[PDB]
Design an enzyme around this catalytic site. Structure first.
Site, PDB file in Angstrom:
ATOM      1  CB  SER A   1      -0.953  -0.077   1.297  1.00  0.00           C
ATOM      2  OG  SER A   1      -0.070  -0.048   2.337  1.00  0.00           O
TER       3      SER A   1
ATOM      4  CE  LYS B   1      -4.045   0.057   4.364  1.00  0.00           C
ATOM      5  NZ  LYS B   1      -3.593  -0.354   3.086  1.00  0.00           N
TER       6      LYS B   1
END
Lengths: 98, 426, 182, 49, 49
Positions: free
Chosen positions: C45, C88
């Site tokens: 990511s 996130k």
């Protein structure tokens, strides 16, 4: 090259999918002449054989079906006879005598 | 004496004793049985807590032991020399039978003996599925019990009669019951989570075909990106360098590096660094089937050739530059067809696969129907140059050719590197 | 470093090597570090974040610290989807709220994760009030444009600044060689 | 692009959160037609699933 | 026990339906006798539409 449909048509054609079939049973180990010949040699020679092959080939059932058709000489009657209250020995008799 | 319970060696006296070598090895009875066979005699087992038992004479062994088991259970058992001393005849079963009308008739007779109600179409479909499982057009799978299981499933769905429709339904249901992973993958592709392009052209991107090793029967595309940069002769396999690389898969990358090094020699070491990445893969790549896809992607990246994203590319390739056969070709072709159908067939999607896999192309009914209708194409190639020609849609030879474009790109990258050196010196 | 995380770094290296070719090998050494992490990084990511940070370091582009950056990126330069996007986004929102929302904090995330954005009530309320922004991008260039607050195209663009920084570093290296010879 | 609140509003709107619901029980394996069909096939055929 | 009873084995006239997470089954289906006996796979989708 661009493959045509004819070059890719692998399926065997069907013409009468409604007609029931009547086929004689195949010999045991059909298409497996190597294993059948090895088992024949082991049977004639009285050797200990071992069947190897990928799992799910039907080896266990085809083996029993093939051995059932075989014909060995009448095995002698083997039985346990007590020579005493503490000692028991093995007795071998002609078949059908025990 | 009357408390002696007969065993296998007693019931099989004068005949045959069929044993499973996996069972013999599993329960530790192998060593005792091996001693009994060599001695030719054995006594019934007595519980050790008995005071003295009977003075029982060992029972003679007048039987023929026939151990049955998968090869793994036997190479795991024949390492002991006493085994090969006792069991000397090896009856080995071929995993496949030659696909012939005689063997189709034999399979029909076997199924009829098993108790099924077969029709000619149903038997034909079962035989075709046996060839499917064998993954060869001229060989049928010898695993008769697997065919019997499929026949049972077809009988349930066909009402006891094995018609062609019933067998087709059984095969479709078998595919569908284990289709959850592929269904999720197709949903992700449609949602855009797994970015796959089956239309248009891209430079250095090709739709490689992989097989999901979690269940080694579902194939699915995995787009492969090659990026060419001047400098070191290294052909970086981003996949392998970051783990995610089969032991065989490393051979494919080195083979491609060797082919590229030996094929394009107008400078010294090849003036380009190619980075190959199975992107959005996140899992190990094991086979070398990527060789053709990686090679064409690298060539396109070198020559700035926009490859067709319509066509998936599968096939191994040696450093001579010739496409070699791969396994599970049906799975990969059908997986790419599934992805194309999910995103909508455009009439130009297809798969580039080796000519050596022609005998292994036993495609599903839907793929064959699409190919016949012209909505899906199958390209058979024998050299990587043919695959690149099909992808980029141009010929190697002649002016404005693919080979000329690749050479021009190589000249450009070599010029960039030598100019870097030139301004380094001055 | 995760086994997958290694792939992200190599993918960024490939994208940077192939994208900026006016010299030979890329004349810059980029060191990427998650400061104060002290624990393994497993996913890819960070690919977009590492890519934009490397591009800014090359071009001396001051990125906005208001915006967090998440998303994987391939060597084509296109942002790919990531997992746990809600976690996130909401974690960055938590950190911004703890330090005080300034009305400009936000998260840059891939367009491929639009279907995965099921945000909490508070994050949605902040977005509606304009105190928090969510930026959806599909190429790393879009993310860099949003961060540095400028377009790459045109004069005084981000791409021109990156090229100028690359030229400066290449000049430093070739000068090292040049006085090395004489 | 800067996503608007409308593009991020995923929650299905509520209009009467005080109204009790009365819904019939769903069929077993609702939304799981694959498992239900597999079990139906196993039940018809007497197979072990 | 000394000898027990000469009990006849009980016939199995049932249908076994083994239920478990996939890990417990790829950890169990590696044996070919499993796929020989348990052939119908009723798989549950982790998400519904």
């Amino acid at each position: 090259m661009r493959l045509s449909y004819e070059a890719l048509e692998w399926r065997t054609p069907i013409e009468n999918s409604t007609e029931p079939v009547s086929l004689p049973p195949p010999p045991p180990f059909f298409g497996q002449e190597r294993a059948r010949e090895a088992l024949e040699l082991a049977i004639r020679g009285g050797f200990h054989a071992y069947l190897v092959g990928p799992p799910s080939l039907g080896k266990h059932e085809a083996l029993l079906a093939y051995l059932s058709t075989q014909s060995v000489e009448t095995p002698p009657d083997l039985l346990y006879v007590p020579l005493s209250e503490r000692k028991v020995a093995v007795l071998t008799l002609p078949s059908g005598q025990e | 004496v009357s408390l002696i319970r007969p065993g296998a060696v007693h019931r099989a006296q004068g005949g045959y004793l069929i044993l499973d070598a996996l069972s013999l090895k599993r329960e530790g009875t192998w060593e005792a049985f091996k001693r009994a066979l060599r001695n030719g005699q054995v006594e019934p087992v007595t519980e050790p807590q008995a005071p003295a038992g009977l003075e029982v004479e060992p029972f003679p062994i007048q039987m023929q032991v026939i151990l049955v088991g998968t090869p793994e259970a036997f190479e795991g058992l024949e390492e002991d020399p006493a085994f090969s001393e006792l069991f000397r005849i090896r009856a080995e079963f071929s995993p496949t039978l030659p696909a012939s009308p005689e063997n189709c008739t034999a399979l029909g007779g076997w199924l009829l003996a098993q108790g099924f109600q077969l029709t000619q179409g149903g038997l034909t479909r079962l035989y075709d599925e046996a060839r499917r499982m064998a993954e060869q057009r001229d060989r049928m799978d010898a695993r008769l019990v697997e065919i019997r299981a499929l026949a049972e499933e077809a009988a349930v769905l066909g009402g006891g009669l094995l018609t062609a429709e019933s067998v087709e339904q059984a095969i479709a249901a078998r595919e569908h019951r284990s289709f959850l992973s592929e269904e999720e993958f197709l949903r992700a592709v449609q949602e855009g989570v797994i970015r796959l392009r089956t239309t248009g052209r891209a430079v250095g991107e090709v739709n490689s075909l992989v097989v999901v090793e979690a269940a080694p029967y579902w194939g699915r595309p995995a787009r492969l990106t090659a990026r060419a940069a001047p400098g070191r002769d290294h052909l970086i396999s981003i996949d392998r360098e970051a783990g995610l690389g089969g032991q065989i898969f490393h051979k494919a990358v080195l083979t491609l590096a060797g082919y590229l090094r030996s094929r394009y020699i107008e400078h010294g070491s090849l003036p380009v660094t190619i980075s190959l990445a199975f992107e959005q893969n996140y899992v190990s790549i094991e086979g070398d089937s990527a060789g053709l896809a990686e090679l064409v992607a690298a060539l396109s990246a070198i020559g700035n050739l926009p490859l067709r994203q319509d066509l998936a590319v599968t096939g191994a390739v040696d450093q001579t530059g010739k496409v070699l056969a791969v396994g599970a070709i049906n799975a990969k072709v059908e997986g790419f067809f599934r992805v194309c159908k999910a995103l909508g067939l455009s009439g130009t999607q297809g798969v580039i696969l080796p000519e050596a896999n022609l005998a292994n192309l036993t495609l599903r009914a839907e793929v064959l129907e699409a190919v016949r209708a012209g909505q899906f194409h199958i390209y058979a190639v024998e050299t990587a140059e043919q695959a690149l020609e099909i992808l980029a849609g141009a010929r190697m030879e002649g002016f404005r050719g693919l080979q000329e474009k690749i050479r021009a790109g190589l000249e450009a990258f070599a010029r960039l590197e030598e100019g870097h050196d030139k301004e380094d010196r001055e």
